[PDB]
């Protein structure tokens, strides 16, 4: 996917609630540094819903695609108010960008 297009999708659709850089501030949602290959509901300092912790999934590219398609469908009771990326292209691009952005 296009990491640059992914960067635009993140800036316009995620950034208001998430930062990506290491030791980045918690905002509406948790900081996403180190997100891939970590268990959900595990950001230090952040207060998750029990649903997010209970989901208990190591985040990877596929489950990320699924979540971001429809976050309430993948984790019922989640407080992330987000419609969903409904175009597979945009999911691939976003995840491409997020892969490197938050390493």
């Amino acid at each position: 996917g296009s990491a640059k297009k992914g960067a635009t999708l993140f800036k316009t659709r995620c950034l208001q609630c998430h930062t990506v850089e290491k030791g980045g501030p918690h905002k509406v949602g948790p900081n996403l540094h180190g997100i891939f290959g970590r268990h959900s509901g595990q950001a230090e300092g952040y207060s998750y819903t029990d649903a997010n912790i209970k989901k208990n999934v190591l985040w990877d590219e596929n489950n990320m695609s699924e979540y971001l398609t429809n976050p309430k469908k993948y984790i019922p009771g989640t407080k992330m108010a987000f419609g969903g990326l409904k175009k597979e292209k945009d999911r691939n691009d976003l995840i491409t960008y997020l892969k490197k952005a938050c390493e």
Partner: protein, 294 residues
């Protein structure tokens, strides 16, 4: 001559299934055209369009309102209060050509309802039957409210639409959605965090963020949070007035309640000025794309 009366009149041989298909077209266009306004989507502007075509109503002589579809004429179109709504109008254009039988008022109001529903808001019952009226029935400019005002102004203004305190607080919750644009209204910025998902975040934000009253690039004063949001003076006055403040805390503690009251208020809004006869169908609750499997 008698007070002006507007009798709902169902489009000849149309029924719930037809309106569901109009809804579907609106919702599908909403889902697919996701780039607009830096990926906010058309949802918020459709909601604003439905409120604006409705908010011209004057309960004292039944002059304004959604019935007449009068937004389609230049005098109402170029109303400075309405700058930016041309986008919602142009959005709804191809849909009107696909269902040329639907009256303009029915289409605008339906746009707003569809938007609120697709954005994961409450279900809003909707009634058809608005009828296009002549160009001389179009309300004068200046019937919509100003932003640089206080709570007293707000309460007073809403009397004209027959809305009480709870209905006003509920309706204002729609400022969870979308943003102000400088070139439209002299105000700039996102109202909140979830720009296109219908939540009770308006209330929560009003109460929980740290706001400062400052001048923007148009020299207008608006309340900005450190978290990057903005509120108009009319919005913030909902925490400056004690009675409003109660209701604000209520909706902030209970989203479900807010959804209920908002659905009631919004439908009332879209229907003010309309008389529905006895033979009229019951109000329609339309199926979202989501519960159709999309």
């Amino acid at each position: 001559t008698t007070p002006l009366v507007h009798v709902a009149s169902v489009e000849k041989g149309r029924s719930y299934e037809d309106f569901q298909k109009v809804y579907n077209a609106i919702a599908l266009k909403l889902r697919e055209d996701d780039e607009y306004d830096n990926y906010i989507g058309y949802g918020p502007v459709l909601v604003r369009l439905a409120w604006h075509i409705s908010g011209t109503w004057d309960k004292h002589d039944n002059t304004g309102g959604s019935y007449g579809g009068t937004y389609r004429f230049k005098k109402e179109f170029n109303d400075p209060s309405n700058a930016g709504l041309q986008n919602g109008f142009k959005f709804l254009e191809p849909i009107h050509k696909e269902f040329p039988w639907i009256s303009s008022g029915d289409l605008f109001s339906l746009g707003g309802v569809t938007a609120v529903q697709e954005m994961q808001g409450p279900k809003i019952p909707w009634r058809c039957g608005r009828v296009d009226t002549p160009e001389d029935t179009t309300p004068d400019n200046g019937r919509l409210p100003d932003a640089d005002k206080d709570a007293g102004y707000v309460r007073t203004f809403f009397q004209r639409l027959n809305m009480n305190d709870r209905e006003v607080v509920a309706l204002m919750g729609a400022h969870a959605l979308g943003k102000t644009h400088l070139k439209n209204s002299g105000y700039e910025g996102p109202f909140g965090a979830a720009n296109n998902v219908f939540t009770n975040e308006f209330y929560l934000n009003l109460l929980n963020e740290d706001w400062k009253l400052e001048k923007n690039d148009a020299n207008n004063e608006q309340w900005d949070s450190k978290s990057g949001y903005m509120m108009l003076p009319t919005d913030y006055s909902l925490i400056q007035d004690p009675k409003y403040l109660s209701i604000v805390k209520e909706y902030a503690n209970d989203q479900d309640k807010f959804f209920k009251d908002f659905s009631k208020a919004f439908e009332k809004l879209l229907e003010n000025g309309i008389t529905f006869p006895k033979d009229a169908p019951s109000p329609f609750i339309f199926k979202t794309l989501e519960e159709q499997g999309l």
